[PDB]
Amino acid sequence: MREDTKVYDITIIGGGPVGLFTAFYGGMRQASVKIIESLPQLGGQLSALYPEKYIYDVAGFPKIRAQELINNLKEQMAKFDQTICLEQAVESVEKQADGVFKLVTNEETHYSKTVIITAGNGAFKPRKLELENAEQYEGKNLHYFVDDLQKFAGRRVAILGGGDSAVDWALMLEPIAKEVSIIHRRDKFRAHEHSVENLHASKVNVLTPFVPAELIGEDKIEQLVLEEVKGDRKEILEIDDLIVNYGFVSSLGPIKNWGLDIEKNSIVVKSTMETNIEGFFAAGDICTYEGKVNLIASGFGEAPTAVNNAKAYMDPKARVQPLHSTSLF
Amino acid sequence: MREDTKVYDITIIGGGPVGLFTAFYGGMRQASVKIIESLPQLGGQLSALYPEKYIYDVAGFPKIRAQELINNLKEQMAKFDQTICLEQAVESVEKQADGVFKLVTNEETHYSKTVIITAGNGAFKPRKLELENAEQYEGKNLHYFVDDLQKFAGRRVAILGGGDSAVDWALMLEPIAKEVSIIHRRDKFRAHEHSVENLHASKVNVLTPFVPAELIGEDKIEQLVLEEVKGDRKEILEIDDLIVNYGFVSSLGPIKNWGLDIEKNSIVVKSTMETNIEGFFAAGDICTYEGKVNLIASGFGEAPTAVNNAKAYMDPKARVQPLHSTSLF
Numbered sequence: 001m002r003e004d005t006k007v008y009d010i011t012i013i014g015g016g017p018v019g020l021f022t023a024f025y026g027g028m029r030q031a032s033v034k035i036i037e038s039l040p041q042l043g044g045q046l047s048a049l050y051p052e053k054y055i056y057d058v059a060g061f062p063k064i065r066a067q068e069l070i071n072n073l074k075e076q077m078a079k080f081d082q083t084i085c086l087e088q089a090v091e092s093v094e095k096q097a098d099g100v101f102k103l104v105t106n107e108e109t110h111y112s113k114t115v116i117i118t119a120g121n122g123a124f125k126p127r128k129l130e131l132e133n134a135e136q137y138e139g140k141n142l143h144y145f146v147d148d149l150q151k152f153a154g155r156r157v158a159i160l161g162g163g164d165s166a167v168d169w170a171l172m173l174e175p176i177a178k179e180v181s182i183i184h185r186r187d188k189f190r191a192h193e194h195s196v197e198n199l200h201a202s203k204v205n206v207l208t209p210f211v212p213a214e215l216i217g218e219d220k221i222e223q224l225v226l227e228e229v230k231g232d233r234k235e236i237l238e239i240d241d242l243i244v245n246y247g248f249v250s251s252l253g254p255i256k257n258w259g260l261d262i263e264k265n266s267i268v269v270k271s272t273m274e275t276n277i278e279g280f281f282a283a284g285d286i287c288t289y290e291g292k293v294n295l296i297a298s299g300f301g302e303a304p305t306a307v308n309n310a311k312a313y314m315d316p317k318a319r320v321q322p323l324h325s326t327s328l329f
Numbered sequence: 330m331r332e333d334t335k336v337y338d339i340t341i342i343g344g345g346p347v348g349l350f351t352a353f354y355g356g357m358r359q360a361s362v363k364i365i366e367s368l369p370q371l372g373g374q375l376s377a378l379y380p381e382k383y384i385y386d387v388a389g390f391p392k393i394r395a396q397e398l399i400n401n402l403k404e405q406m407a408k409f410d411q412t413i414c415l416e417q418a419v420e421s422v423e424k425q426a427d428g429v430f431k432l433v434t435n436e437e438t439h440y441s442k443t444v445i446i447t448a449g450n451g452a453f454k455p456r457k458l459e460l461e462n463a464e465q466y467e468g469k470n471l472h473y474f475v476d477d478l479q480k481f482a483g484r485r486v487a488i489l490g491g492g493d494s495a496v497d498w499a500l501m502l503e504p505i506a507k508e509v510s511i512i513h514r515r516d517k518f519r520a521h522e523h524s525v526e527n528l529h530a531s532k533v534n535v536l537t538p539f540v541p542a543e544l545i546g547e548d549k550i551e552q553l554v555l556e557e558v559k560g561d562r563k564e565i566l567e568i569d570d571l572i573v574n575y576g577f578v579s580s581l582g583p584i585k586n587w588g589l590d591i592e593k594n595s596i597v598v599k600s601t602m603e604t605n606i607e608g609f610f611a612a613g614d615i616c617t618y619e620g621k622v623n624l625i626a627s628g629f630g631e632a633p634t635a636v637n638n639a640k641a642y643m644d645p646k647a648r649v650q651p652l653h654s655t656s657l658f
């Protein structure tokens with residue numbers, strides 16, 4: 001456990017589109033801002049679940065690719081300073097006797113005058129490989145996320161999964177790795193058909209329909225045993241790295257342990273976006289109220305409402321209504 | 330008075346950015362949509378007051394020119410059918426015994442299952458020329474709006490005002506009209522300095538500091554008498570057309586006569602965006618609630634909230650939550 005003893009003005013739980021616009025608006029109100037995000041990337045549902053898809057109902061965009069929207073939000077907030085804490089899932093939020101919120105994650109303890117939760121459906125986490133010794137290889141050569149293609153250069157790689165992630169990494173690693181194998185439990189992939197076309201055309205070693213049976217290696221993974229689906233025949237791969245792309249899981253989890261008024265897996269908010277805990281606000285898919293719709297455009301309206309009311313809560317001399325952006329820059 | 334006997338699903342009062350996105354979302358929910366707007370253009374405050382300025386706090390736009398945002402919204406809604414009624418200010422809204430709303434404007438009577446008011450600060454109207462006989466020349470050769478530059482081709486034009494509108498029309502008409510004069514009550518113009526530079530460089534006849542003293546013409550305006558400010562000297566122009574660009578006025582006006590719960594010139598709404606009158610919703614700058622901020626991004630979140638709840642009000646089989654746009658198109 002580490003501890004950040006800077007009391008931020010606004011600490012945002014979740015770096016999806018709504019959290020990103022919340023962060024931007026915090027900057028507009030000259031507030032110190034921290035984003036805490038479970039994944040090693042920002043972008044929430046858009047980046048994790050449909051980065052390639054075109055969205056048609058965000059105000060002002062006849063169409064926009066989901067990842068492009070996320071990148072635009074990142075560009076928007078780039079004019080201001082934010083502290084971004086990735087690979088941290090908030091487990092505890094408590095308002096201390098002095099009024100300051102203490103937030104504790106799996107890695108670090110944080111402090112804030114206000115908290116704005118923009119957590120969607122809860123903390124995104126990778127689906128884990130359900131093998132007894134799999135955890136022991138985490139932080140060695142068992143990978144759930146890929147942050148650097150070049151670290152596989154000249155190495156033998158096995159990839160588990162049949163989705164766009166597994167297929168994309170396989171094709172991205174083909175020209176870099178010494179050897180790439182992809183293992184999927186079905187002859188049919190989930191990945192986009194054009195990507196699958198490219199996969200079968202490539203020199204990637206496709207193994208279907210197989211599931212991973214065991215990991216052999218005293219310290220580092222050395223061999224991967226596979227078993228055929230609807231067939232009694234084992235396969236053994238000599239590998240240097242194992243990449244697991246079994247998709248994402250989310251749950252509110254400990255979000256339900258903080259004394260919040262929660263209905264139907266959503267945090268209930270007043271029209272100010274404030275929860276039942278003073279100084280604790282919510283916006284986006286995580287929040288609810290009579291008439292709430294889970295949309296990006298709805299979240300993008302809730303974000304500035306939360307920020308501007310948070311600012312007025314912190315500074316009794318500050319007005320809820322912000323100045324015109326057209327003159328501020 | 331004319332009468333449109335089609336009962337629309339959603340009738341929107343005001344075609345500013347929030348009304349435009351409301352119209353779009355109506356299409357997304359397969360609702361018949363009408364927009365009624367006071368001005369001969371859509372775009373509200375953006376198009377009327379700052380079309381040239383870059384906005385920095387609309388979600389997903391690092392920067393966007395105000396008129397470009399309006400045009401983007403128009404493009405968004407172009408995929409669906411809307412009936413657009415310009416140059417109509419709604420004066421009366423009444424929910425009839427059958428539950429259908431009757432709306433009456435200066436021109437036309439309309440009917441709707443739901444009304445969503447997106448009126449901002451009230452109906453935009455041009456500042457009128459305060460001369461006893463000025464009204465008699467309306468619809469002849471006295472113009473508050475310019476819809477067609479070419480109808481001034483080869484004609485003698487006088488333009489009143491010192492703002493960007495007066496200056497822009499003067500410069501737009503210079504290569505088209507036989508003769509252009511601009512009359513402003515101050516030696517200093519409000520218009521952007523580069524436009525004023527172009528104005529003084531042009532062949533436009535600049536008359537400052539003058540005010541219009543009287544209109545001569547039995548039927549059509551034939552002569553315009555001007556008087557100098559801080560000076561006793563008259564001027565007489567032979568003109569074919571008079572354009573008055575004295576800017577815009579707005580007021581809620583009759584919006585306060587419809588039985589709505591109004592506080593501080595704003596219509597109070599529940600979190601569904603519904604007013605105190607069932608089936609009558611509000612969004613954007615016209616609405617208020619605890620924590621409301623008058624922003625484009627806020628309005629853009631309120632719009633879909635109003636539409637989706639309006640849809641559920643009209644059709645008890647419809648869910649408030651819409652389908653994903655990413656699959657709908």
Ligand SMILES: Cc1cc2nc3c(=O)[nH]c(=O)nc-3n(C[C@H](O)[C@H](O)[C@H](O)COP(=O)(O)OP(=O)(O)OC[C@H]3O[C@@H](n4cnc5c(N)ncnc54)[C@H](O)[C@@H]3O)c2cc1C
Binds near residue numbers: 049050122294
């Ligand atoms: C396939 C699909 C298509 C869609 N299409 C559309 C569409 O066309 N138009 C539209 O408007 N909407 C669409 N949506 C819905 C849209 O994605 C959501 O409204 C939007 O993602 C909500 O954004 P958010 O920032 O509130 O939440 P999210 O995007 O869910 O982001 C929340 C973030 O919070 C993080 N987090 C949560 N809890 C913690 C914690 N305790 N600690 C640290 N981090 C945490 C998560 O890891 C995540 O990154 C679609 C959704 C899906 C799945």
Ligand SMILES: Cc1cc2nc3c(=O)[nH]c(=O)nc-3n(C[C@H](O)[C@H](O)[C@H](O)COP(=O)(O)OP(=O)(O)OC[C@H]3O[C@@H](n4cnc5c(N)ncnc54)[C@H](O)[C@@H]3O)c2cc1C
Binds near residue numbers: 342379623
């Ligand atoms: C100079 C300036 C700079 C600004 N800068 C920013 C900024 O940087 N960021 C930001 O978020 N916001 C900014 N704003 C505020 C922003 O313009 C408003 O939040 C936005 O215009 C609200 O949109 P709207 O559709 O609700 O209302 P409006 O834009 O006011 O449009 C309402 C429309 O309704 C029509 N109408 C009203 N009543 C009737 C009636 N009875 N019958 C028929 N038609 C009617 C009006 O004619 C008008 O066209 C700025 C405003 C100004 C003036």
Ligand SMILES: NC(=O)c1ccc[n+]([C@@H]2O[C@H](COP(=O)([O-])OP(=O)(O)OC[C@H]3O[C@@H](n4cnc5c(N)ncnc54)[C@H](OP(=O)(O)O)[C@@H]3O)[C@@H](O)[C@H]2O)c1
Binds near residue numbers: 051165168
């Ligand atoms: N370029 C792009 O378009 C792109 C890139 C990345 C992600 N995405 C999108 O983001 C979302 C996430 O996709 P992603 O692949 O991470 O995850 P995904 O779509 O959920 O696919 C996960 C894969 O893991 C397999 N799997 C899960 N548990 C397993 C188990 N216990 N044993 C064996 N196999 C198991 C699944 O098998 P089954 O298929 O048999 O269920 C599936 O093939 C998807 O919608 C994807 O389209 C798109």
Ligand SMILES: NC(=O)c1ccc[n+]([C@@H]2O[C@H](COP(=O)([O-])OP(=O)(O)OC[C@H]3O[C@@H](n4cnc5c(N)ncnc54)[C@H](OP(=O)(O)O)[C@@H]3O)[C@@H](O)[C@H]2O)c1
Binds near residue numbers: 490491519
């Ligand atoms: N291309 C562009 O950038 C562009 C184009 C169009 C509009 N706009 C913007 O839109 C807004 C509207 O501008 P617009 O010119 O319609 O209106 P405006 O800026 O309000 O200017 C109105 C002009 O009318 C004059 N006026 C008003 N009443 C008068 C009276 N009774 N007698 C004499 N003169 C009178 C004013 O004089 P005084 O100045 O002395 O008060 C002013 O010069 C402005 O912010 C403008 O910048 C921008």
Ligand code: NA
Binds near residue numbers: 049
């Ligand atoms: Na997919």
Ligand code: NA
Binds near residue numbers: 285
């Ligand atoms: Na929710």
Ligand code: NA
Binds near residue numbers: 378
């Ligand atoms: Na101006």
Ligand code: NA
Binds near residue numbers: 449594617
């Ligand atoms: Na208002």
